[PDB]
Amino acid sequence: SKVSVAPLHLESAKEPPLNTYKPKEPFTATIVSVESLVGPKAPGETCHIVIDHGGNVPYWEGQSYGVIPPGENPKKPGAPQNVRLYSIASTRYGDNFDGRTGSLCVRRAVYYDPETGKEDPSKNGVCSNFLCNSKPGDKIQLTGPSGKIMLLPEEDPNATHIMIATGTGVAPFRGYLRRMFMEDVPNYRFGGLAWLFLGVANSDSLLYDEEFTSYLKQYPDNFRYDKALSREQKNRSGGKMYVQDKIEEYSDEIFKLLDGGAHIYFCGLKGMMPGIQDTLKKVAERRGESWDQKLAQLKKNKQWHVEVY
Numbered sequence: 001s002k003v004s005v006a007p008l009h010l011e012s013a014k015e016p017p018l019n020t021y022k023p024k025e026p027f028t029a030t031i032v033s034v035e036s037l038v039g040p041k042a043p044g045e046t047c048h049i050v051i052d053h054g055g056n057v058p059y060w061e062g063q064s065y066g067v068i069p070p071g072e073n074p075k076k077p078g079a080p081q082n083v084r085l086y087s088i089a090s091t092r093y094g095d096n097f098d099g100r101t102g103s104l105c106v107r108r109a110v111y112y113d114p115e116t117g118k119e120d121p122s123k124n125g126v127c128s129n130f131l132c133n134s135k136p137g138d139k140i141q142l143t144g145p146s147g148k149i150m151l152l153p154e155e156d157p158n159a160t161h162i163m164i165a166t167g168t169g170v171a172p173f174r175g176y177l178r179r180m181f182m183e184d185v186p187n188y189r190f191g192g193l194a195w196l197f198l199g200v201a202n203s204d205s206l207l208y209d210e211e212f213t214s215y216l217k218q219y220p221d222n223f224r225y226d227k228a229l230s231r232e233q234k235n236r237s238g239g240k241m242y243v244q245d246k247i248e249e250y251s252d253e254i255f256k257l258l259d260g261g262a263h264i265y266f267c268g269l270k271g272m273m274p275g276i277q278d279t280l281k282k283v284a285e286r287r288g289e290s291w292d293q294k295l296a297q298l299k300k301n302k303q304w305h306v307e308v309y
């Protein structure tokens with residue numbers, strides 16, 4: 001069955017929380033756990049970070065937390081570090097189903113010299129390494145939450161939601177899908193179609209795959225799930241298999257869903273977008289449609305949701 005979540009008063013707010021904590025006075029949260037999400041063949045580490053905010057920093061699905069890593073701002077002596085934003089990967093109830101924790105999905109940013117591969121700790125991403133190096137009990141300076149672009153439209157509980165992720169961009173969708181399928185939320189009973197597309201480098205780089213695969217068996221008429229593994233698969237045009245190529249395998253179904261009012265979401269590194277736009281333009285052309293006109297209508301209709309970084 002669906003998992004009991006508490007406290008249900010988290011459903012009462014009519015607007016998303018925004019900027020509850022600000023950079024000059026962050027909330028000092030506590031790490032619950034840090035675990036690698038990836039196997040040995042993954043090109044880099046991505047970790048799942050669980051943070052106890054005590055119920056003091058609630059959020060809605062699709063929002064981001066800010067994290068201020070320790071140390072001086074290298075560009076502003078005497079000043080704290082700049083906030084880094086992370087898409088929240090949990091529902092508002094969090095992974096403990098209690099409204100006290102939130103989770104992040106963090107790629108460790110590691111520098112390698114382009115010719116020798118030599119590392120340099122001074123050039124590593126400050127906050128991603130800080131988070132992935134964290135341990136239970138460590139303290140985190142948390143700000144926010146913030147963001148509205150990726151809030152889940154719940155007005156139609158039978159809407160269609162097409163979720164396009166690369167890498168850590170799966171984060172908001174983990175939250176959406178737990179709310180849609182896993183958690184007992186009496187005021188949001190999802191009966192539409194949720195369709196997750198995930199592009200990663202290889203099978204060892206998959207994120208939360210067992211969770212998503214479980215939804216196929218639990219909600220076979222409401223959930224679809226397709227994966228692209230760039231270093232292990234090739235598209236029909238012999239390039240590395242990217243998320244836009246998987247979309248094209250379902251070009252007719254996807255365009256029909258869009259025409260029927262589906263929401264479509266994009267999240268992950270901003271470099272995922274040019275190839276997606278190229279594929280959608282070519283799909284439209286083969287159908288005798290103008291992708292420019294289709295995208296203009298999707299934006300006008302508030303069906304098009306992008307948060308890339």
Ligand SMILES: Cc1cc2c(cc1C)N(C[C@H](O)[C@H](O)[C@H](O)COP(=O)(O)OP(=O)(O)OC[C@H]1O[C@@H](n3cnc4c(N)ncnc43)[C@H](O)[C@@H]1O)c1[nH]c(=O)[nH]c(=O)c1N2
Nearest residue numbers: 084085086087105106107109123124125126127128168309
């Ligand atoms: C709305 C939104 C949502 C998200 C994200 C952004 C935004 C705007 N991000 C990105 C996140 O905010 C952040 O930018 C990255 O984690 C990198 O931050 P660091 O502090 O690790 O790198 P930092 O900001 O310190 O450095 C940036 C980059 O520069 C490189 N670098 C530094 N000095 C260098 C030098 N001298 N030469 C060469 N390279 C050098 C670092 O290695 C790093 O790759 C994200 N990220 C994520 O992992 N998961 C998520 O869910 C999200 N979500």
